[model samples]
Target chain A: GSFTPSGTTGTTKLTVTEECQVRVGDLTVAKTRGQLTDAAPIGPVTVQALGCNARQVALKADTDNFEQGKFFLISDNNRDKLYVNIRPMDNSAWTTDNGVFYKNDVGSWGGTIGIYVDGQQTNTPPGNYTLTLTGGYWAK
Target chain B: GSFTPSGTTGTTKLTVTEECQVRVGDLTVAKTRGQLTDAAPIGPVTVQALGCNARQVALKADTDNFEQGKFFLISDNNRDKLYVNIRPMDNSAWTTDNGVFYKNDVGSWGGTIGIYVDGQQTNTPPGNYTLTLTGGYWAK
Candidate 1:
């Protein structure tokens, strides 16, 4: 027969850092300028989490016309926890008046953001436009 | 059979692009924050030539104070053809009261720009400051 043991308890400290990550293609510059039609791959951009402790992430090309693509999760990856891409898969994904792209509840997420150009305009500014991502995460 | 042939002539086009290269350590961000004293290695930054067809190159820390070092060429490399580092070895290197650094005639050049910080201060800003390299090259 065994005697009942006295109650025991343990405690440990956990430190979490909430920081956004641009895993790849952090500061990519467009290649060449002028006479571009048909979809051209701008390489794969993978981003995870958000900064400044917020719940939403948004994306928009400096020149938000003719260049677009949809975001999708990698195989066996998070769906609601991640968002990937500057373009939209459905009309409801983007607000009509904002002229911008956004993903909601993209916390604890990882996905690829594919971008492309599909128009011919030689007079447009040089291919030096940037895609800005805005998001937030929980603060310590 | 010994008659001399008429003089022959030849012409060709030569196009040259003058561009400055930040061969390594371009767009680098500092690591960690606070309580940094003594000299710390900021990694090696190399530059070759200048952009916009200019012959002068300059460098300065966003918070220029205790951080300092000297620039020197890689072995068997350009000497007068390059200028590096944000710190100076002599008083003549930097203009008085400007609080900036410069190297002239850094054309067709390559050298390492070394930087380090030496001080003890806890009230300063985070380690997110940037080092800017300003130079010029011959633009087409």
Candidate 2:
């Protein structure tokens, strides 16, 4: 039998967790605001602001399976406007519904910060997954 | 470049396996008739019936996720009865109106029999994930 036909049977337990934090360009330390869940959308996550207009932040997960691409705003001109022209080969989904994230885990206000998920390259029945984004501006 | 995420990159695989079998007494079992499909439901596993009176067989998984809870009637009143009274503990909300069993995984009569998965306990947007069910029955 592929399985033990008989023995004291016991079921295994599985649990999944989430973490939302990131490293801004050149910053040795990682930062965070909150995590996302069906219950709440979290963040105000910090990003590189001044110094480097050539600023580029990379987002990633240790493994795939993290679904639901997410976006942490990368505002510019002083955290007010969303960033447009992004880096190539990076960036996930850039959909728009407006500014408020899954607030009540339902229909809430949507904000298209300079940040967004480029989400068509990804699809699934909803699962454990990851999202990655990288972009910046060139001080011309 | 920034994006709205288009194109499927790759998908993660999540597999849940189960062995539906059990040993009653004097080395006998209420074993699986067969496994069900992610698209179709199946089973009425044969339980060892020949002993025990006021006889009853209860099927349950340790986790609410297993989703297979049932009872088969075995009798002579010497053979037991498989009365699908799945425990309220591991009993996933038995939804659907009725069932001879989920007629077919492609969508059917919708049952909680050899067919089950009271998937109401948890919810997700929709993504591929594995679900495994295997366990035993308690004698009365």
Looking at chain B only, the TM-scores across the models are 0.38, 0.23
For residues B1-140, write the lDDT of model 2, one tens digit per residue: 11111112211112111121221111112222222222222232322222223322222222222223432222223232222232222233332111111111111111233433222212211111322223222321
DockQ, in order, for the candidates?
A: 0.01, 0.01
Tens-digit per-residue lDDT, B38-113, candidate 1? 3544444555443424444444322222123433212111111111234433332332113234554333444665
Candidate 2 lDDT (Cα, 0 to 1): 0.22
Candidate 2's C-alpha runs over 4 A off are A1-140, B1-55, B66-113, B116-123
Docking class of 1: incorrect
